[PDB]
């Protein structure tokens, strides 16, 4: 679909390393295979928000800030603004704080010409307590607000088809990575499988092969 | 209670200004009235995590990192570690992601001799959708895990009393600020009331007078 982001090879790198030298090194080597890198707070809090612009300049990649924004609207607005001012192309936001908190992010994204991803669900064991039960309603909330981009877990293929049902065929959906997953998700996210490999470029190339 | 923190004058400054000069200027003036400052992402993402150490050194204050940590356990551990390495005395973490995500933070706090505050509820309109309904269970989850410190909303006195009932009289509870709030909360948090005042030192002094 034309109005949603084009992710090279349908593979996003989750660059979760906390030191700038390793992150830059492991990443530089895969820019041939990947054009979209997800960075989170472990790296940005350790090395500074300036690292976002550094990735974009050195690699020419799109940056998704995996900040799991989860505050009141006024604070959400400020987080999104600081993050986009630092150069992030997109930001991942929690839905559990409700519609006004999500809308706060959408407002800034619209102003600055950037993207908001709604995190609908999580796959770690504790997700069962509150998150799993809210996931469908969170997804519908996003749809009802015109959210275009979503993050969903891949540890359950039947969970992905359900999400895809809710958000429709036009929405952009990313999930952890893979053959089954991409029946539903537009792109898969790879972290350790790549950044802890001796030849990250090789590890990336491999995944992409299985993707064809 | 001896095993939980002493907050000077029962008043925490929420330093939500995003500019380092303004933040430092407003804060210095109230160090006489407050010894505990809450810093969030708007300031730290704008100015760098080094600002935490700067507050502690310039004012000798305790810093609570209002980062509303809400990720998977492995990522929570790293966020907490980076935050405590930067000098934060405490960190605020969401309970909605479940027990393992909270425990991840507790582990690092234990290791490094710092504190975790469990955010049990929020008071913005969107909180009604998912957070309000989870609040009591989140509070009980914290108690069951030995969490000592809690953040609760003050827009409803009767909500504070319920929280206090769950966490018991020994736990430390902080809430927005005021007279009846302190019947339940150990300390109140003041933000704009202070930092957007012509005489912050005055605005602070006044609040403390009401606290008697």
Swiss-Prot record, chains A, B:
It catalyses: orotidine 5'-phosphate + H(+) = UMP + CO2. InterPro entries: Aldolase_TIM (IPR013785), OMPdecase (IPR014732), OMPdecase_arc (IPR047595), OMPdecase_AS (IPR018089), OMPdeCOase_dom (IPR001754), RibuloseP-bd_barrel (IPR011060). Coiled coil: none annotated. Gene3D superfamilies: Aldolase class I (3.20.20.70). CDD domains: OMP_decarboxylase_like. The active site is at 68 (proton donor). Keywords: Decarboxylase, Lyase, Pyrimidine biosynthesis. The keyword Signal does not apply. One of its GO terms (biological process) is 'de novo' UMP biosynthetic process. It is an enzyme of class 4 (lyase). This is Orotidine 5'-phosphate decarboxylase. It comes from Methanothermobacter thermautotrophicus (strain ATCC 29096 / DSM 1053 / JCM 10044 / NBRC 100330 / Delta H) (Methanobacterium thermoautotrophicum). The gene is pyrF.
